[PDB]
Ligand SMILES: Nc1ncnc2c1ncn2[C@@H]1O[C@H](COP(=O)(O)OP(=O)(O)OP(=O)(O)O)[C@@H](O)[C@H]1O
């Protein structure tokens with residue numbers, strides 16, 4: 001990742017890459033989004049000062065069930081930690097948190113032989129909406145200073161490219177350990193909802209990238225990426 005397409009304002013970098021045929025190793029960046037979407041059509045507030053970009057991957061190269069989102073999440077957290085010198089956490093299966101507030105969201109979509117990844121990073125948002133204020137923060141709120149969005153973008157893209165290359169010729173074993181230790185709510189009571197309901201203690205992560213939940217009837221391995229993890 002080195003070549004960038006930088007737009008001032010657009011409906012959604014995800015939507016744009018659905019209509020436009022871009023080559024691999026190219027990231028579409030937008031300063032603002034009017035129709036920013038989440039993992040289920042939810043509104044993703046994208047005001048000025050934030051980082052919003054999408055890129056394409058080969059659906060025949062990466063298995064995007066659970067492993068991919070975890071590696072992408074690891075990548076962004078590794079980049080942010082190197083720049084801000086602040087520790088970050090990973091929410092299974094696809095989000096980057098600081099303490100209890102979300103700082104970055106990772107999204108993957110498939111639209112006709114296309115694997116489209118969309119990452120949103122809160123960096124320099126000055127005014128934060130109350131409806132998300134309780135579960136979201138920015139780099140500016142944490143550190144108390146602004147950060148060069150382009151520099152952060154390049155770092156994130158470098159960590160992604162490196163992690164994915166090592167994910168190709170090798171396996172998820174190279175990341176499993178690192179991710180497990182950074183998992184949010186590790187060893188705490190949690191609840192999983194969405195296409196079922198499993199409750200227990202988050203005891204760790206499996207080799208397949210599945211969540212290990214200790215229930216009253218033993219440890220269950222959750223292999224579905226539709227489950228939302230909440231604190232319980
Ligand atoms: N710029 C932003 N930064 C952080 N959070 C945002 C931003 N814009 C929207 N959100 C919130 O993120 C939510 C979408 O995230 P999503 O619903 O995919 O999380 P989830 O994984 O389902 O829930 P959980 O994080 O509890 O597992 C929206 O409900 C919205 O309130």
Ligand SMILES: O=C(O)CCCC[C@@H]1SC[C@@H]2NC(=O)N[C@@H]21
Pocket residue numbers: 012013014015033035036037038039040044051052053054095104105106107118119120121
């Ligand atoms: O947390 C989530 O639910 C995923 C959020 C993904 C947001 C990014 S920001 C750029 C790209 N375009 C979008 O409409 N969403 C992704």
